[PDB]
Amino acid sequence: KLLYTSANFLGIPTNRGQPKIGTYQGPELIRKSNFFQLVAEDGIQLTDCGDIIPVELNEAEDPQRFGMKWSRSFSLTTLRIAERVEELMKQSNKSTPLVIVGGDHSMATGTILGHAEAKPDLCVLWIDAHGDINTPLNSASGNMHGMPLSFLVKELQDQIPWLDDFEGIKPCLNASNIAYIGLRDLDAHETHDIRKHGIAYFTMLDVDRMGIEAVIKEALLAVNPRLEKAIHLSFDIDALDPLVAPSTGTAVPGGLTLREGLRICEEVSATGKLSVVELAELNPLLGSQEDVLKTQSSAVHILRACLGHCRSGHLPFKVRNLTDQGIMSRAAHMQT
Amino acid sequence: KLLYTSANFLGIPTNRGQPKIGTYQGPELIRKSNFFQLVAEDGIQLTDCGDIIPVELNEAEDPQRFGMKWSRSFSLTTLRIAERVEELMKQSNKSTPLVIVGGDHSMATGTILGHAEAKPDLCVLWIDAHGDINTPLNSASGNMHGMPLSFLVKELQDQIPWLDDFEGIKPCLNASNIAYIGLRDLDAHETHDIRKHGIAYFTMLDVDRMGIEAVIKEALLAVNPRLEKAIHLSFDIDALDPLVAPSTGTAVPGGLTLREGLRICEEVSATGKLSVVELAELNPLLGSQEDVLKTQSSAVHILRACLGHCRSGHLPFKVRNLTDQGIMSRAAHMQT
Amino acid sequence: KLLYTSANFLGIPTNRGQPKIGTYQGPELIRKSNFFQLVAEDGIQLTDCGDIIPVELNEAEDPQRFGMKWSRSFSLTTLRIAERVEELMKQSNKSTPLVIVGGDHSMATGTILGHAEAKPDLCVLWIDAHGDINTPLNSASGNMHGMPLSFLVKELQDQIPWLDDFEGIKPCLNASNIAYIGLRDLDAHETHDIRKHGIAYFTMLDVDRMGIEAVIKEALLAVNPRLEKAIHLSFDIDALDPLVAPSTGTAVPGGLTLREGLRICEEVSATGKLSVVELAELNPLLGSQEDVLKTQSSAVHILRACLGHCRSGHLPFKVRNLTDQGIMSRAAHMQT
Ligand SMILES: NCCC[C@H](N)C(=O)O
Ligand SMILES: NCCC[C@H](N)C(=O)O
Ligand SMILES: NCCC[C@H](N)C(=O)O
Ligand SMILES: [Mn+2]
Ligand SMILES: [Mn+2]
Ligand SMILES: [Mn+2]
Ligand SMILES: [Mn+2]
Ligand SMILES: [Mn+2]
Ligand SMILES: [Mn+2]
Description:
Chains A, B, C: Mn(2+) 2 binds at residues 128, 130, 236, 238. The structure is a homotrimer. Chain A is α/β, with parallel strands linked by helices.
């Protein structure tokens, strides 16, 4: 009656992937909400596996390299994340989905690396306003949260500078294993690489012309045609329109409505193949108090959908009956 | 040229159906707006029939019974409402629609009861994020605004505790006479009853997959196949997304857009069978000043649509002409 | 690779077309944004042609005439605008689109007049919540921004009072050359004239039932069947929902989403016939600081789309390569 009867929860408070302080508070924004309560009420046993501690070096230990900011903090954090995620997914080897709350999106290199160690044939559904696939020398910002996929994609490795501390970050994805939904702010070099290597992608223009139902179907067709593969769902909260998720560092107008976001998560959940979902780029230090509440609320609804919550309702585990209590009903009285 | 040339307006400031003070100010939020002016400008004669005075007992006179809060205030108020609504609909027996502004949604038991006395074969279109069909012993809150339909539905009467003061509240609806649109927060026991008794329902998931045009058509097909029946349109303002109706007590993200709400009302109005429309759960004491204005504005647009306002425009009652005023036009001058 | 490789930019700070001070700051709201930077980054050469100075007479020199407010300021401003626009379009005779930022919508009489002098067979796509086609004696407000099209439409000239200072304002449009998208607040006499003279129009009701993709196709079919005609795109920011463009003087709920607005502009741009786009009714003096930022942001996204910005990405002008820098890649290292 439930596709997933248990799940794990993990916080990853990355904040060295981008300059705005506050993504480290993402996991707590969700712990402080009613998310856990709501999940239990649907009958799912959710275990809080705690937080990963990111490695945050000082400036002297972690100077710019190839224009990257905090690259050694990134490589060390990536390996720590991957080890923990691999551990969790293998103890789990009705499957047990891992729910990850960030943290800026640079965490994805580690979560996918570790996940792929447990499930080498996985596919990735990347829900984001951005491509997050800049190679280091094409990045205008040097911000790691804009590069996480590039280190993972085999076809891109002639464009990644070699670094000794990156050796353990082994590319584990083929371009054919990734699909994007929600794109609306690609850098020119990302567009070039995505098209050159045939990465499946559905931008907001595609969502407008095709409708979200067809986009979801086509994205799943592209990377998981017969639902044979485990799914890594990487959901950047900034994929959603700023009107519903204002508290995030790189907001872009004209995004997915909450309902469109829910449909993506509902369909992914219903495949029975949801293996990891991560939710990135929440920043409770951005915007007004009401902004933060709106963002928290959207995130909670999204994560609930991923775990199988149905907007059309759920049936009670036990159906209550008046007579059992020794109470007289209207119908009964009307007989007398 | 108009489907309805006159209408009645009635306030019902119920506030004992739920804990948040302020729904009693709903009717005044609409009187203070330009609603009456706008309706007259479309050529409709709208008569303000005043307010019903709810019965509000003190705690000593109205203790909890079967976990219900303010249940005797409810039964007495229900009967007072029904008497007044029946009176209005029978003096009205181009039909004359009654527009009712609440007030929390507990008023619906009385409005439908009285309406059905005048028109026994009516159907109900219930636009709401919530089912409002909890039976008393399944209600977690004890709030009457979450139970109004259960006392009316014949099939549910073996689940309603008998109470002497409820005797005059006679179930007047079959499950086959009700259709929901907009649902997204059903309690488990509501889901059970709705499915068990075959109540037609279209949740936000249905709206997403089918589109609002198909949902409206299917809802009308389910309960009013050949437009033979009078329609009771019960519209909870919280059916609309919180972004357009923030000032309401149980807001739920991912609701109907204003345009989707307008389409429901436009199609219902155009059947020629709109007999009662009630608008529930406005609370001007919730949210910011701008929040209240947004909510007031949405409500006004909704009610105008119900009465036949057309977004594609209306023709003038008398067409003005330059010559009649003894004024020289450009065209005329250009001849000389 | 680009449909338009250069464009001109012109400010028109009209504020005598309506009573609310602040539309004169519209052009500066756009100059202060990153619009110019973003346009250059797409490879378009955009030349700032400065501002037109409106003629603003004092009350004594410009009394009401036929109920019109500031009508002589309007006629003189109209002729000044037309002269400048004609000049620009003829020096331009890959075409070079002119981008105009207002300023209240009364400027349209002049921009279209001047544009038509350069391109007599043009068509007009009018994106607006309002018809802006009231003739003077039917206008309840006397506000010129509600009348700009009436002076231009040949079929309406028997309803325009003759005024000596209006002689040079020659009607240059047939009713068959105009299509509206986005309408939701037509005055009765506008509805009469639009229907009587067969002006193509798609209201928000049409957008709801047909979808924006079909509306755009039908609007272009109506006035530019084989893409033979130059297009004058007149975009009132109030066509967009108040949730995304709050800072404007006559806001109406239930408007186009930003995405729907983008689709209109993308399709118009892609015809290769975009000759003038004007963006009207920005008022930075209305609403909160965040309101103004939202409005500025929507306007920038809209104007970028008009010039050919693609949400699905653009290719780099030069593709960067690691080796050129004498840098060692991961792929290369892995061979050694
Ligand atoms: N995660 C936001 C990424 C923004 C930009 N593409 C970058 O590379 O920084
Ligand atoms: N009207 C809101 C109802 C919320 C909940 N279903 C309840 O029974 O109270
Ligand atoms: N531009 C807003 C126009 C509003 C009204 N139709 C008028 O004629 O003033
Ligand atoms: Mn992003
Ligand atoms: Mn991202
Ligand atoms: Mn409700
Ligand atoms: Mn309700
Ligand atoms: Mn307008
Ligand atoms: Mn306008």
